[PDB]
Structures are given as C-alpha cells and as structure tokens.
Amino acid sequence: SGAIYVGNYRVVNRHLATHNDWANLVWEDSSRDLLVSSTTAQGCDTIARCDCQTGVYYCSSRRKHYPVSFSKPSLIFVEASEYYPARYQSHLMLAVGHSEPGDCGGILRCQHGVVGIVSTGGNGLVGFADVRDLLWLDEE
Numbered sequence: 001s002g003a004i005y006v007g008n009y010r011v012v013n014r015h016l017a018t019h020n021d022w023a024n025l026v027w028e029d030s031s032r033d034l035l036v037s038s039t040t041a042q043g044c045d046t047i048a049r050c051d052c053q054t055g056v057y058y059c060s061s062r063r064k065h066y067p068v069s070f071s072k073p074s075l076i077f078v079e080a081s082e083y084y085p086a087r088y089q090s091h092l093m094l095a096v097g098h099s100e101p102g103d104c105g106g107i108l109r110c111q112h113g114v115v116g117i118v119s120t121g122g123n124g125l126v127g128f129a130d131v132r133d134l135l136w137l138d139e140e
C-alpha cells in the first residue's frame with residue numbers, strides 16, 4: 001500500500017483505489033495502473049521533473065529502502081494477476097530488486113523528488129509506474 005500526496009492530489013495504484021478515490025476522480029489510466037483523486041488537505045510531496053535512472057525505493061515486505069538503477073518508462077508485458085488479465089503496461093520502469101504484491105504503492109525517489117510508485121514485480125525484478133510526465137500534478 002501507499003500513495004503520493006502532491007498539492008490537492010492523491011496518486012495511488014489504480015487496482016488499490018478506494019470508493020472515495022473513484023467518487024473524487026481527477027484522472028485514471030488502466031494501462032498505467034494509476035489513479036489520481038482530489039483531496040481537501042494539501043500534500044507535501046514534490047514530483048521529480050528529470051530523466052534520473054538511479055534512486056531509492058521503499059520495500060514494505062523487507063521494511064527497507066533499497067538504492068537501485070532502473071530503466072526508462074516503456075511499454076512492458078505484465079503477467080495476469082487477480083487485478084488485471086495479461087496485458088502491456090505503459091510508462092513502466094524496471095529494476096533488479098525484491099518485491100511482493102503488497103509492496104505496490106512504495107515510493108521510488110531520486111534527488112529531485114518522487115519518480116513513481118511500485119506497481120509490478122516477480123522473479124527478482126520490480127516495476128514502478130512513472131509519474132514524472134504528469135506535469136499538471138504541480139498546478140491547479
């Protein structure tokens with residue numbers, strides 16, 4: 001579990017979004033596994049605006065923050081799960097690291113701020129949904 005709180009926005013994995021999130025929906029994309037909902041309170045996270053390929057992510061299944069190298073956002077084949085059939089997920093970045101389904105929502109960050117959240121994994125590889133292209137998160 002986990003979310004990014006930037007301004008009056010809440011960014012979560014689409015497959016973990018709540019009823020309040022769907023009721024207060026701003027934008028969602030099934031192919032990115034992302035959902036953004038509105039909030040009444042202001043958040044304190046900063047979204048990175050960069051091309052960094054190194055950062056640190058939180059892994060709740062180990063209670064640890066791991067430094068990683070990750071690939072640039074791309075269209076990747078993702079195996080079926082209880083949340084989606086087998087499909088291609090867009091804007092996804094991979095790293096060599098540990099992850100379990102419950103780790104989704106863990107933040108990946110670089111020196112410029114939040115890069116994305118854990119979204120896929122298995123076989124010693126962890127995938128993160130990129131948020132750095134969503135410029136509107138910094139305004140209105």
Ligand SMILES: Cn1cc2c(CC(=O)N3CC[C@H](C(N)=O)C3)cccc2n1
Nearest residue numbers: 033081083099100101104119120121122
């Ligand atoms: C973070 N992580 C996801 C894992 C999965 C796959 C899985 O449960 N999901 C849920 C939806 C997500 C998606 N975006 O398609 C994939 C299997 C094994 C280890 C995993 N570590």
Ligand SMILES: [Zn+2]
Nearest residue numbers: 050052110112
């Ligand atoms: Zn950066």
